[PDB]
Amino acid sequence: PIFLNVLEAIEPGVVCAGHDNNQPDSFAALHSSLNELGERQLVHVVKWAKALPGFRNLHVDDQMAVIQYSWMGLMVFAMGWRSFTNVNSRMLYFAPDLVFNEYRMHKSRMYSQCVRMRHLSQEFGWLQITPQEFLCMKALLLFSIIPVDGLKNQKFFDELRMNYIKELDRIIACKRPTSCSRRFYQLTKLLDSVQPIARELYQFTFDLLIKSHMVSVDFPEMMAEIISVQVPKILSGKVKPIYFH
Ligand SMILES: C[C@]12CCC(=O)C[C@@H]1CC[C@@H]1[C@@H]2CC[C@]2(C)[C@@H](O)CC[C@@H]12
């Protein structure tokens, strides 16, 4: 099972946010820690992506592009899995030192987005997603958002994305024909549901970056760069998700 061997081998370990839990749960402290966690997780997402089967087949400029458009969906999907496995999904397990309860959901002023993230987390339980399904679904999320004008070499991207869809298909077929088809429908519907959630968070973090000097929220360098250079291409419609349905 070469493909799943690789996905297990490269899956990132635990990342802490560095949050001071003795602080009061203020809007500023909570988002400053979420932003630091994003910066820390971005390092791991880059190293993970570059180690995926076939990823180096992409043009080098397309490699950075797909990471810089897919990161929010990748990290929210992984956080949903962490939450499902660690607290059976009624708190958001952003990190071992940054677990959101309903109070922090409210204080962060992103309660409705947290509710949608919690619903995504719960789907791992409702659908009884296996670790292998999770790993292959998360890899596919890296290949699920691109510029409407295409990448520098779109042909190799389309081929790579095709191959990851095939791997998802194999994972479903190894498990068990009408059940295979039902499962693939369920998993592709689940994958589609990540992008609307990521879009809402992209809108929220963009607005927060613009007003960050007035609400006392710190943005690390890579986050500030990606959210001002790449995220607005998503929000203005220059970069769009690839949906199954
Ligand atoms: C990706 C992160 C951080 C990593 C994670 O586990 C998911 C979580 C989802 C919300 C993001 C957060 C990074 C910082 C953001 C973008 C804040 O600015 C607003 C929403 C936060």
Tab-separated table of C-alpha atoms and ligand atoms in Angstrom:
chain	number	residue	atom	x	y	z
A	1	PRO	CA	0.000	0.000	0.000
A	2	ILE	CA	2.543	2.554	-1.136
A	3	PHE	CA	0.249	5.573	-1.320
A	4	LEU	CA	-1.207	5.225	2.183
A	5	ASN	CA	2.223	4.417	3.614
A	6	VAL	CA	3.349	7.816	2.368
A	7	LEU	CA	0.331	9.775	3.596
A	8	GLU	CA	0.728	8.306	7.085
A	9	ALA	CA	4.474	8.944	7.120
A	10	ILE	CA	4.201	12.660	6.275
A	11	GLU	CA	1.188	13.560	8.416
A	12	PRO	CA	2.183	16.421	10.754
A	13	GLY	CA	2.350	15.883	14.493
A	14	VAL	CA	1.010	18.063	17.295
A	15	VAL	CA	1.424	21.831	17.000
A	16	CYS	CA	0.835	24.090	20.006
A	17	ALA	CA	-0.433	27.641	19.695
A	18	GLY	CA	1.666	29.046	22.526
A	19	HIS	CA	-1.468	30.510	24.105
A	20	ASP	CA	-1.293	31.809	27.680
A	21	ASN	CA	-4.361	30.173	29.185
A	22	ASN	CA	-4.057	32.288	32.353
A	23	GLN	CA	-5.045	35.362	30.301
A	24	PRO	CA	-8.687	36.418	30.174
A	25	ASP	CA	-10.492	35.275	27.022
A	26	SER	CA	-10.387	38.543	25.128
A	27	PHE	CA	-11.009	39.030	21.421
A	28	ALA	CA	-7.421	40.262	20.995
A	29	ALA	CA	-5.669	37.511	22.932
A	30	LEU	CA	-7.692	34.750	21.286
A	31	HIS	CA	-7.084	35.900	17.716
A	32	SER	CA	-3.433	36.705	18.390
A	33	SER	CA	-3.014	33.068	19.460
A	34	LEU	CA	-5.047	31.724	16.546
A	35	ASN	CA	-2.851	33.744	14.185
A	36	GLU	CA	0.336	32.414	15.775
A	37	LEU	CA	-1.054	28.886	15.437
A	38	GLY	CA	-1.783	29.574	11.780
A	39	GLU	CA	1.787	30.751	11.229
A	40	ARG	CA	3.127	27.639	12.954
A	41	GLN	CA	0.801	25.311	11.046
A	42	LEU	CA	1.700	26.995	7.741
A	43	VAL	CA	5.294	25.768	8.160
A	44	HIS	CA	4.032	22.193	8.545
A	45	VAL	CA	1.570	22.449	5.661
A	46	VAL	CA	4.363	23.508	3.299
A	47	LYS	CA	6.625	20.656	4.368
A	48	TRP	CA	3.742	18.189	4.136
A	49	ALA	CA	2.616	19.322	0.673
A	50	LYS	CA	6.124	19.209	-0.785
A	51	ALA	CA	6.416	15.576	0.377
A	52	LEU	CA	3.164	14.352	-1.239
A	53	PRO	CA	3.431	11.837	-4.092
A	54	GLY	CA	3.677	13.686	-7.408
A	55	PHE	CA	3.578	17.197	-5.915
A	56	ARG	CA	6.983	18.068	-7.373
A	57	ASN	CA	5.531	17.304	-10.825
A	58	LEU	CA	3.813	20.702	-10.549
A	59	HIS	CA	5.489	23.862	-11.763
A	60	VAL	CA	7.318	25.440	-8.816
A	61	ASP	CA	5.102	28.540	-8.991
A	62	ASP	CA	2.005	26.346	-8.969
A	63	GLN	CA	3.297	24.517	-5.888
A	64	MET	CA	3.338	27.682	-3.798
A	65	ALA	CA	0.068	28.885	-5.319
A	66	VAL	CA	-1.957	25.777	-4.443
A	67	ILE	CA	-0.617	25.858	-0.871
A	68	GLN	CA	-1.422	29.542	-0.538
A	69	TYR	CA	-5.036	29.056	-1.705
A	70	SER	CA	-5.831	25.759	0.046
A	71	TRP	CA	-4.315	26.304	3.514
A	72	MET	CA	-7.477	27.448	5.304
A	73	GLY	CA	-9.449	24.421	4.104
A	74	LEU	CA	-6.568	22.073	4.890
A	75	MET	CA	-6.189	23.397	8.411
A	76	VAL	CA	-9.920	23.496	9.176
A	77	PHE	CA	-10.368	19.914	7.944
A	78	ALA	CA	-7.473	18.708	10.094
A	79	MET	CA	-8.772	20.673	13.101
A	80	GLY	CA	-12.152	19.000	12.651
A	81	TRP	CA	-10.469	15.608	12.775
A	82	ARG	CA	-8.495	16.566	15.901
A	83	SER	CA	-11.714	17.772	17.529
A	84	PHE	CA	-13.581	14.589	16.626
A	85	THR	CA	-10.811	12.363	17.982
A	86	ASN	CA	-9.935	14.404	21.096
A	87	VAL	CA	-13.180	15.783	22.515
A	88	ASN	CA	-15.681	13.955	20.278
A	89	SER	CA	-16.419	17.322	18.611
A	90	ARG	CA	-18.268	19.554	21.075
A	91	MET	CA	-15.260	21.745	21.511
A	92	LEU	CA	-12.957	22.993	18.785
A	93	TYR	CA	-9.497	21.512	19.389
A	94	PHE	CA	-7.403	24.087	17.576
A	95	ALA	CA	-4.388	22.994	19.599
A	96	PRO	CA	-3.765	21.213	22.911
A	97	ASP	CA	-3.306	24.642	24.501
A	98	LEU	CA	-6.102	26.407	22.555
A	99	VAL	CA	-9.417	24.549	22.904
A	100	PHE	CA	-12.534	26.658	22.280
A	101	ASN	CA	-15.572	26.307	24.526
A	102	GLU	CA	-18.775	28.260	23.874
A	103	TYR	CA	-17.479	31.249	25.846
A	104	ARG	CA	-14.379	31.554	23.651
A	105	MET	CA	-16.593	31.019	20.594
A	106	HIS	CA	-18.524	34.127	21.660
A	107	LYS	CA	-15.545	36.217	22.806
A	108	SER	CA	-13.784	35.623	19.473
A	109	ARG	CA	-16.826	37.142	17.702
A	110	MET	CA	-16.737	34.207	15.275
A	111	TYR	CA	-19.361	32.015	16.950
A	112	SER	CA	-21.334	31.267	13.769
A	113	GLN	CA	-18.179	30.205	11.950
A	114	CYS	CA	-17.254	28.024	14.929
A	115	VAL	CA	-20.674	26.381	14.770
A	116	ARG	CA	-20.082	25.446	11.127
A	117	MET	CA	-16.608	24.106	11.994
A	118	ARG	CA	-18.139	22.040	14.771
A	119	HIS	CA	-20.698	20.654	12.295
A	120	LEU	CA	-17.848	19.616	9.994
A	121	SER	CA	-16.086	17.960	12.918
A	122	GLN	CA	-19.252	16.025	13.767
A	123	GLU	CA	-19.442	14.656	10.211
A	124	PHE	CA	-16.339	12.563	10.866
A	125	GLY	CA	-18.425	10.766	13.494
A	126	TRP	CA	-21.701	10.685	11.586
A	127	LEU	CA	-20.035	9.307	8.439
A	128	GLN	CA	-17.584	7.177	10.470
A	129	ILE	CA	-14.638	8.401	8.417
A	130	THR	CA	-11.621	6.125	8.656
A	131	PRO	CA	-8.092	7.461	9.146
A	132	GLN	CA	-7.255	6.374	5.598
A	133	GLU	CA	-10.297	8.170	4.201
A	134	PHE	CA	-9.367	11.278	6.199
A	135	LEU	CA	-5.785	11.253	4.917
A	136	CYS	CA	-6.776	10.880	1.275
A	137	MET	CA	-9.562	13.456	1.573
A	138	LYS	CA	-7.157	15.960	3.140
A	139	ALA	CA	-4.626	15.455	0.347
A	140	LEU	CA	-7.364	16.088	-2.233
A	141	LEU	CA	-8.187	19.388	-0.502
A	142	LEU	CA	-4.759	20.667	-1.558
A	143	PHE	CA	-5.919	20.262	-5.170
A	144	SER	CA	-9.378	21.770	-4.783
A	145	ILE	CA	-8.908	25.529	-5.366
A	146	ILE	CA	-7.203	27.274	-8.317
A	147	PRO	CA	-7.201	30.526	-10.325
A	148	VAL	CA	-10.013	30.858	-12.823
A	149	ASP	CA	-7.323	31.734	-15.396
A	150	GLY	CA	-5.525	28.482	-14.576
A	151	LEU	CA	-2.128	27.617	-13.170
A	152	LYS	CA	1.193	28.060	-14.964
A	153	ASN	CA	0.856	24.494	-16.167
A	154	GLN	CA	-2.699	23.365	-15.670
A	155	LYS	CA	-2.268	20.052	-17.482
A	156	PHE	CA	-0.034	18.530	-14.827
A	157	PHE	CA	-2.345	19.847	-12.105
A	158	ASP	CA	-5.395	18.229	-13.725
A	159	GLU	CA	-3.525	14.928	-13.996
A	160	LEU	CA	-2.344	15.043	-10.385
A	161	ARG	CA	-5.819	15.928	-9.108
A	162	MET	CA	-7.226	13.043	-11.170
A	163	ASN	CA	-4.732	10.662	-9.573
A	164	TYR	CA	-5.688	11.706	-6.046
A	165	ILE	CA	-9.362	11.166	-6.880
A	166	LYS	CA	-8.427	7.675	-8.077
A	167	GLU	CA	-6.662	7.021	-4.780
A	168	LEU	CA	-9.786	8.052	-2.857
A	169	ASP	CA	-11.793	5.668	-5.040
A	170	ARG	CA	-9.372	2.826	-4.290
A	171	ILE	CA	-9.565	3.466	-0.548
A	172	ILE	CA	-13.346	3.130	-0.712
A	173	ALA	CA	-13.156	-0.017	-2.873
A	174	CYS	CA	-10.518	-1.660	-0.655
A	175	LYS	CA	-12.826	-1.223	2.333
A	176	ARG	CA	-15.721	-3.119	0.694
A	177	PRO	CA	-20.379	-1.576	-5.572
A	178	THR	CA	-23.563	0.286	-4.608
A	179	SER	CA	-22.006	0.771	-1.171
A	180	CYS	CA	-18.832	2.040	-2.876
A	181	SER	CA	-20.920	4.514	-4.901
A	182	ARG	CA	-22.832	5.665	-1.815
A	183	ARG	CA	-19.555	6.158	0.072
A	184	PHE	CA	-17.914	8.121	-2.718
A	185	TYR	CA	-20.982	10.350	-2.946
A	186	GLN	CA	-20.848	10.928	0.817
A	187	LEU	CA	-17.136	11.723	0.881
A	188	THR	CA	-17.263	14.082	-2.100
A	189	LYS	CA	-20.227	15.904	-0.581
A	190	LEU	CA	-18.196	16.242	2.633
A	191	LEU	CA	-15.203	17.587	0.690
A	192	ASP	CA	-17.388	20.147	-1.077
A	193	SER	CA	-18.662	21.373	2.292
A	194	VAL	CA	-15.196	22.500	3.396
A	195	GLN	CA	-14.848	25.298	0.854
A	196	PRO	CA	-17.833	27.427	1.998
A	197	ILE	CA	-16.533	27.219	5.564
A	198	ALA	CA	-13.029	28.226	4.484
A	199	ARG	CA	-14.498	31.137	2.496
A	200	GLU	CA	-16.256	32.467	5.572
A	201	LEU	CA	-13.038	32.259	7.555
A	202	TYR	CA	-11.105	33.916	4.729
A	203	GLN	CA	-13.577	36.796	4.814
A	204	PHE	CA	-13.281	37.035	8.583
A	205	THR	CA	-9.484	37.022	8.699
A	206	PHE	CA	-9.238	39.564	5.869
A	207	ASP	CA	-11.524	41.964	7.722
A	208	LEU	CA	-9.597	41.327	10.922
A	209	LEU	CA	-6.246	42.053	9.252
A	210	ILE	CA	-7.503	45.375	7.865
A	211	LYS	CA	-8.692	46.521	11.303
A	212	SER	CA	-5.944	44.799	13.310
A	213	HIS	CA	-4.113	47.954	14.485
A	214	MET	CA	-7.379	49.201	16.055
A	215	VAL	CA	-8.426	45.934	17.764
A	216	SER	CA	-4.908	45.085	19.041
A	217	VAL	CA	-4.580	41.779	17.145
A	218	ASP	CA	-1.097	40.754	15.981
A	219	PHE	CA	-0.593	39.037	12.625
A	220	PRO	CA	2.663	37.158	12.004
A	221	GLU	CA	4.598	37.918	8.823
A	222	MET	CA	3.620	34.965	6.623
A	223	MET	CA	-0.027	35.253	7.661
A	224	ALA	CA	-0.057	38.994	6.977
A	225	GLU	CA	1.511	38.405	3.548
A	226	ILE	CA	-0.798	35.571	2.484
A	227	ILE	CA	-3.935	37.283	3.765
A	228	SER	CA	-3.167	40.548	1.958
A	229	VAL	CA	-1.709	39.069	-1.277
A	230	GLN	CA	-3.492	35.747	-1.881
A	231	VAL	CA	-6.708	35.721	0.183
A	232	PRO	CA	-8.174	38.728	-1.675
A	233	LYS	CA	-7.864	36.787	-4.942
A	234	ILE	CA	-10.265	34.256	-3.427
A	235	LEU	CA	-12.578	36.925	-2.060
A	236	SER	CA	-12.662	38.815	-5.384
A	237	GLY	CA	-13.386	35.638	-7.352
A	238	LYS	CA	-10.061	35.363	-9.181
A	239	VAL	CA	-9.421	32.035	-7.392
A	240	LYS	CA	-12.279	29.577	-6.974
A	241	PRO	CA	-12.880	26.134	-5.462
A	242	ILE	CA	-13.239	23.056	-7.605
A	243	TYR	CA	-16.475	21.412	-6.483
A	244	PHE	CA	-17.540	17.842	-7.221
A	245	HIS	CA	-21.302	18.549	-7.316
B	1	LIG	C1	-6.431	28.239	10.482
B	1	LIG	C2	-6.705	28.469	11.977
B	1	LIG	C3	-5.486	27.985	12.777
B	1	LIG	C4	-5.238	26.486	12.688
B	1	LIG	C5	-6.466	25.668	12.936
B	1	LIG	O1	-6.461	24.705	13.675
B	1	LIG	C6	-7.713	26.141	12.242
B	1	LIG	C7	-7.917	27.640	12.477
B	1	LIG	C8	-9.172	28.123	11.756
B	1	LIG	C9	-9.416	29.598	12.047
B	1	LIG	C10	-8.244	30.470	11.610
B	1	LIG	C11	-6.962	29.968	12.279
B	1	LIG	C12	-5.786	30.858	11.865
B	1	LIG	C13	-6.011	32.329	12.209
B	1	LIG	C14	-7.342	32.853	11.652
B	1	LIG	C15	-7.259	33.000	10.120
B	1	LIG	C16	-7.871	34.149	12.287
B	1	LIG	O2	-7.291	35.322	11.707
B	1	LIG	C17	-9.370	34.129	11.936
B	1	LIG	C18	-9.727	32.640	11.706
B	1	LIG	C19	-8.452	31.894	12.130
